[PDB]
Ligand SMILES: CC(Oc1ccc(O)cc1)(P(=O)(O)O)P(=O)(O)O
Ligand SMILES: CC(Oc1ccc(O)cc1)(P(=O)(O)O)P(=O)(O)O
Ligand SMILES: [Mn+2]
């Protein structure tokens with residue numbers, strides 16, 4: 259693990275950022291909009307992202323960045339082979355402005371376009387999720403393992419309704435949920451952050467997560483936490499996972515993942531690596 | 534206060550039960566079915582309820598009970614004027630079976646058919662929610678207050694899909710969710726327990742909860758926590774909350790509650806005081 263120093267620095271930065279987010283979640287909210295009345299942001303997201311990028315630049319000036327709010331400011335979401343930090347300063351902005359207690363700082367680190375480590379700090383909970391390729395996944399000193407469940411009819415899934423309110427899109431998201439729900443599955447849960455939903459699969463508390471519409475910074479930190487806990491990532495088609503494709507299944511195993519893929523009708527989405 | 538001693542004792546019992554649940558969620562389980570393959574129970578539910586009822590009976594032998602698993606064993610869900618303990622030994626049985634970290638012990642105490650106090654212990658989180666009529670609502674000794682939000686388009690709701698897998702029922706649950714979602718609201722969350730969903734409204738972290746299909750023991754502990762935090766309970770018709778009706782809206786205020794009620798199509802259900 260030659261990236262141990264980098265990950266340990268990422269953990270300290272995530273904890274620092276988490277403290278900023280915790281302080282801000284107790285204070286007055288000035289909610290701002292991005293593309294729609296349900297695509298939210300605050301000054302805290304922007305402050306935290308700028309702190310993270312400037313701190314990483316100081317120690318690792320040759321590295322590259324992909325950050326949610328930097329992309330909103332016009333930066334590109336193109337992943338080269340160069341070591342790259344893929345940052346979501348606050349995953350769960352809707353939760354944050356409501357003080358719903360699942361908000362995370364997410365950092366994924368890629369080399370040769372492959373994730374080498376991931377850090378997800380659920381900062382109201384004070385849960386530091388981490389994983390390094392080949393070294394396992396952890397939450398606050400506890401090594402993580404996905405569940406063993408291979409029977410979809412005894413599974414607990416996690417998903418979210420999405421940021422679209424387009425009637426045809428909402429109908430397809432609800433149809434997909436209906437089809438899975440009526441297999442049946444034991445249930446479906448929604449805590450409101452992609453990174454925390456995925457970390458819940460890594461812990462074994464849920465058996466699988468799926469969503470269409472995520473961005474690369476939503477899944478770059480948590481994906482490796484799922485796989486180092488023994489899980490799998492794939493596209494909702496069953497095809498290989500792609501960070502820039504807007505789609506993911508993060509599951510305990512390929513049996514549940516492929517069974518979920520068989521019920522998901524795909525919605526058209528703009529890739530993060532294209533204009 | 535003639536019921537503060539009962540409340541103090543209820544808190545002690547809820548914490549004791551919660552410690553049993555906490556230990557059991559880490560261990561092997563015997564997962565059993567009740568009315569269907571998605572209506573679950575474990576031996577821990579049954580053990581905890583028997584402990585709670587035997588403990589209350591020894592200290593208050595003239596009091597009555599309505600306990601979830603005792604009703605499953607043939608006891609009646611009739612609420613008289615006699616002091617009555619309305620118990621859910623484990624709210625979130627599906628979550629418990631999956632180790633999804635939101636499970637609660639719920640105790641509501643009614644006199645003359647009106648709730649006088651409520652205790653909800655979210656076991657895995659270690660959060661003790663309490664409220665006595667006229668005395669405020671608390672979480673781990675800290676006073677709670679519902680959110681101020683009166684604009685439904687800036688609200689965060691909590692709800693659940695339900696225990697039914699009947700196609701017509703599921704379609705109606707999802708249609709109700711679609712209508713609210715597309716008002717729009719900011720989002721919908723699902724942590725998997727009625728009592729914890731309601732306590733999230735009492736804290737202000739969510740603006741409102743609604744569900745059809747709950748039972749009296751799901752809402753008897755948490756309802757008073759919502760109202761002592763400054764919120765409201767209502768039927769999905771917009772009318773008075775009815776503890777045995779299977780339906781609830783628990784909101785920060787009447788503006789959001791009535792707006793939610795306007796979108797809900799009522800699902801037919803057998804009342805808890807019907808056979
Ligand atoms: C909506 C955002 O993140 C997600 C993604 C998927 C979810 O289920 C929840 C939150 P958020 O702003 O980070 O809160 P995104 O980064 O995609 O704009
Ligand atoms: C399903 C049960 O309670 C609920 C009720 C409503 C929910 O949204 C979640 C759990 P649970 O067994 O307590 O988990 P019920 O007491 O109704 O059988
Ligand atoms: Mn965003």
Ligand SMILES: [Mn+2]
Nearest residue numbers: 326346348349
């Ligand atoms: Mn974000």
Ligand SMILES: [Mn+2]
Nearest residue numbers: 346349350476
């Ligand atoms: Mn995000």
Ligand SMILES: [Mn+2]
Nearest residue numbers: 572573601626
């Ligand atoms: Mn039950």
Ligand SMILES: [Mn+2]
Nearest residue numbers: 601621623624
């Ligand atoms: Mn129960």
Ligand SMILES: [Mn+2]
Nearest residue numbers: 621624625751
């Ligand atoms: Mn219950």
Ligand SMILES: [Mn+2]
Nearest residue numbers: 682683684687
């Ligand atoms: Mn307003």
